[PDB]
Design a protein around this ligand. Sequence first.
Ligand SMILES: *S(=O)(=O)N1CCOCC1
Ligand code: SF4
Ligand code: SF4
Ligand code: FCO
Ligand code: F3S
Ligand SMILES: [Mg+2]
Ligand SMILES: [S]
Lengths: 263, 545
Amino acid sequence: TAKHRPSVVWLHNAECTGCTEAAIRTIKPYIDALILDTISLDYQETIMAAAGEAAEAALHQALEGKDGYYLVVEGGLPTIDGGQWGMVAGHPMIETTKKAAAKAKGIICIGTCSAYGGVQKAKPNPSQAKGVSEALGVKTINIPGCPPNPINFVGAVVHVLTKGIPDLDENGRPKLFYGELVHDNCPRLPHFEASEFAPSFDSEEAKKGFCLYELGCKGPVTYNNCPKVLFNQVNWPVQAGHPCLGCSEPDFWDTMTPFYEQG
Amino acid sequence: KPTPQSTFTGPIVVDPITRIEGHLRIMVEVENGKVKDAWSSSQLFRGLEIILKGRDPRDAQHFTQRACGVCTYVHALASSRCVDDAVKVSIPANARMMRNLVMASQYLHDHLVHFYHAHALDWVDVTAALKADPNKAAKLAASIAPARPGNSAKALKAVQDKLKAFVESGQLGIFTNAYFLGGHKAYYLPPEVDLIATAHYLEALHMQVKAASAMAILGGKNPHTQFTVVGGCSNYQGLTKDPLANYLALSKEVCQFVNECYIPDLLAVAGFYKDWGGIGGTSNYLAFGEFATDDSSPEKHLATSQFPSGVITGRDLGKVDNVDLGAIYEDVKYSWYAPGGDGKHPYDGVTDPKYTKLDDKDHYSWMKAPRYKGKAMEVGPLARTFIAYAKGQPDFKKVVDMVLGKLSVPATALHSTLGRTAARGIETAIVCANMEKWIKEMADSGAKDNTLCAKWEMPEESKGVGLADAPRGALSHWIRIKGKKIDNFQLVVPSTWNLGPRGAQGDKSPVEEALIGTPIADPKRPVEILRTVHAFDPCIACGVH
Ligand SMILES: *S(=O)(=O)N1CCOCC1
Ligand code: SF4
Ligand code: SF4
Ligand code: FCO
Ligand code: F3S
Ligand SMILES: [Mg+2]
Ligand SMILES: [S]
């Protein structure tokens, strides 16, 4: 029988691989079911068997597939010195991503780095790292956060494959996951409203679970679904007593710092 | 019984090295089927040390954690230890306990995924699993591991059927162009062992979700934890009964998988590849230790780490030397940095990027070359294992001897790619054996004391160092504070030690040395290069930062 699951090519540029790691924390479905039954994951450096020229051949076979493919991009694009500070198989990352983007059925940027540039773009940006859209002038479906919840990434992939392009906000993020502020769903909101704040991490107020706004919490300016869905089915940063860093916002490394202040 | 080896003479380049973190190009020269020279060429620079200059020292841990999301947490921990040292704060006992448990959880998650999802495909021919008799495989599994339903013939057959449907679909996905397709002389396992390992590879994808959920009870989330602050931790809930009960339950499930699947699979694989106990060795080992009972200073960390610190040189297990933090430096001679940067202790670190060209053997990596008293040092599970074994650490003596007896090999056989792989499993079993004790310690401490963050003040000018032994080895972060801001922040990371380039004297790094003598059965499918490189568990985002 002639069979085909939609081809996904996943590229790693200037990244920490935390987005790949987040993706494999999915439980609806688990990652094995996704790659056995739903997609054909045709290039993925972190987990693929082929290496070297065999891996590069697998990439080319996927990019030339007659059925087309979806492109997932993890990491920013380092552009300084002709793109040479980030290379795979002797090719600048920006060159390979440009080529893959040009024929992709759709482009999903997993993480703040591919969506907006991320940690390596933070001032003074030694490698002149750029987000994918910033570098290439192409529209992308952005699944940001550092890393995003697998619920948001796998949810977006499944949506793209079964329903179409989900409604995106002005930062390219699906409203399904990014339509609400972290703060608006935070269980510490009743403390915030009552101006009940922890003045320090050692304080009795912190022990009592008071709001973390005075300690820098960016929940009020950050669009994500963290308190609603949790991470790892168990926790999220504020529940663990720590302020939100704003990690799903563009350029947060520069716009949300200092992290323990309200700048 | 001879190790397969071609007569190939010529160059081999493997780029990308897949099934590692980050971007690595390996070049080797081969003569008569054995590697005679090697280069470890890291292919991405980000420049986190540069980015940190002038920033708030409190922010460092959030940036440096993004050095890597495979070894998530560990850089937040090293940065936190570093700033704690710089501000001269001693964290409360509960914060030491919580930080060290989150490290333990990370070791379990990271080593399980490494063995199955990164390394196993170098030893296991997945397609050969389709040829196995599942009843024979179940009988074998019953002889080499505890009884478990996932090892039943019915369960193994269900795995075979899934894999058969996938292979016959025409879309091989992550197995496209695998080195084992069509058969490969360097792959030794019986089909039944391939099937058992492949079944466990799939189970491990589910079990690593549980290992990450355990870690997140204390860490806030995984990847990229968010529970550490200057002076300790923020997670008061993680000191309490129900969360710690759930953390114990999840950790027990994970450890059951370590003991039932990881260790028996590792020993089965090792038994068939005993020749690999004579390939891939190095001679010098460094650890800063981890799981300390006193983390009030870097010196106390070194002295009181339950996985002890130390230095071994020349394979001499009769002597372990104390770590001198003043003796660490990094070279850049063979790296993509400006001339003039050799011999820098990390408090005097300089990160001045200067690219030349691909395969310039005078400058071939974005990693610096860390050296210790003039020598390259291997770091990671094998370093920790030899240091602990040499010192008579009782858990390492027990578990190492178990493995030596099962395989009928001496401790010296561990100076090898097989040994490096075995050590990773050994220490995973030992972390498992200690989880209940460490959890009870923190549960009893958290029940009587909710001090989790100490008070502190930012100094105008100071310096400090944070040490950790992360899953890949000796990690250190080094800060100079001036004007209450970061004046210099230098990371020296385990994959920097293991996979950096040559040092100022032209001396090969541990992976470059380990690659000398590698046999190559088929130069078009050089799985033997991957076996050794993967055994070091490389992380290039870590190594370069
Ligand atoms: S803060 O600037 O006080 N914060 C309050 C409410 O929403 C966003 C900003
Ligand atoms: S978005 Fe964050 S977690 Fe993902 S690759 Fe970038 S630094 Fe890593
Ligand atoms: S802790 Fe943060 S997200 Fe929660 S109520 Fe306070 S400011 Fe909002
Ligand atoms: N373990 C780990 Fe990552 C590396 N190398 C760090 O530190
Ligand atoms: S730091 Fe990021 S993971 Fe959620 S809680 Fe804040 S958006
Ligand atoms: Mg460094
Ligand atoms: S495809």
